[PDB]
Amino acid sequence: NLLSPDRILTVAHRGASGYVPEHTILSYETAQKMKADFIELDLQMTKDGKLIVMHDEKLDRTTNGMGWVKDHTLADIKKLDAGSWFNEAYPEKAKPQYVGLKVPTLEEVLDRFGKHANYYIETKSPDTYPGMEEKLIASLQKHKLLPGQVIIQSFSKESLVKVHQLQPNLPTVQLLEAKQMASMTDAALEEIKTYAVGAGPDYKALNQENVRMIRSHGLLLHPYTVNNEADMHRLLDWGVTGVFTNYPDLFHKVKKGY
Ligand SMILES: [Ca+2]
Ligand code: NA
Numbered sequence: 001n002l003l004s005p006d007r008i009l010t011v012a013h014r015g016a017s018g019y020v021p022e023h024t025i026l027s028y029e030t031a032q033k034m035k036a037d038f039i040e041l042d043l044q045m046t047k048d049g050k051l052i053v054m055h056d057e058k059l060d061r062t063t064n065g066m067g068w069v070k071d072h073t074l075a076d077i078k079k080l081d082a083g084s085w086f087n088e089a090y091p092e093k094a095k096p097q098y099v100g101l102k103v104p105t106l107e108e109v110l111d112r113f114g115k116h117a118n119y120y121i122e123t124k125s126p127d128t129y130p131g132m133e134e135k136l137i138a139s140l141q142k143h144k145l146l147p148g149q150v151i152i153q154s155f156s157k158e159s160l161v162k163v164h165q166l167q168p169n170l171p172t173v174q175l176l177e178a179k180q181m182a183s184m185t186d187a188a189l190e191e192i193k194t195y196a197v198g199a200g201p202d203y204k205a206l207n208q209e210n211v212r213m214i215r216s217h218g219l220l221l222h223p224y225t226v227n228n229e230a231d232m233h234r235l236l237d238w239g240v241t242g243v244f245t246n247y248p249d250l251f252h253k254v255k256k257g258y
Pocket of ligand 2: 061
């Protein structure tokens with residue numbers, strides 16, 4: 001099954017974001033067609049309390065809007081162009097159909113794919129957007145998704161502990177920045193295992209030894225953000241159990257050898 005350590009998972013990071021503007025319905029659809037195991041979502045909360053999918057706290061990078069998501073209503077956000085930025089940033093990858101792509105709500109992504117997709121969803125520290133975890137859980141329940149159907153990822157330990165006590169059968173993954181992974185110990189991994197099924201470190205901090213160490217605690221191991229073929233091979237040879245990639249078709253091809 002999806003949470004088996006012997007299964008290698010393709011997590012399409014913000015969808016097929018290497019080819020399609022990140023965190024759009026089209027990006028996720030493309031990831032699905034490319035046979036990704038999971039589509040990956042980041043959440044922000046609007047002024048009127050709605051969960052939308054966006055990586056940054058600000059609209060600036062990926063829309064023609066400006067400012068903090070939480071200062072804008074959903075209605076105004078839905079007017080924005082969340083695709084043209086990609087054509088500008090990567091002119092060699094530009095496509096006319098990317099003009100006018102919209103920011104989706106969490107609700108729209110879940111409604112779009114239902115049980116036909118598996119979702120890898122980020123939460124924030126609970127103080128960032130109060131009630132985010134509860135709204136997320138309720139949205140998942142609405143679409144009858146509450147395993148491996150949904151994995152919750154977060155840098156925030158408190159968020160994952162909260163999730164784990166609210167929904168004990170909702171798999172979580174502790175995200176780890178480079179320096180955190182650099183100084184990882186068996187004790188810390190043992191702590192992580194009490195609420196999380198896996199770890200998700202910056203892949204740059206990985207080597208054979210600490211990969212073996214994470215694996216020794218029976219934890220899943222999904223480094224981010226792995227886009228280069230050479231790195232895919234090295235990490236799989238070391239023993240990671242999946243990756244976050246912007247190029248899910250490439251990783252699909254590579255992992256067949258492992
Ligand atoms: Ca991510
Ligand atoms: Na912009």
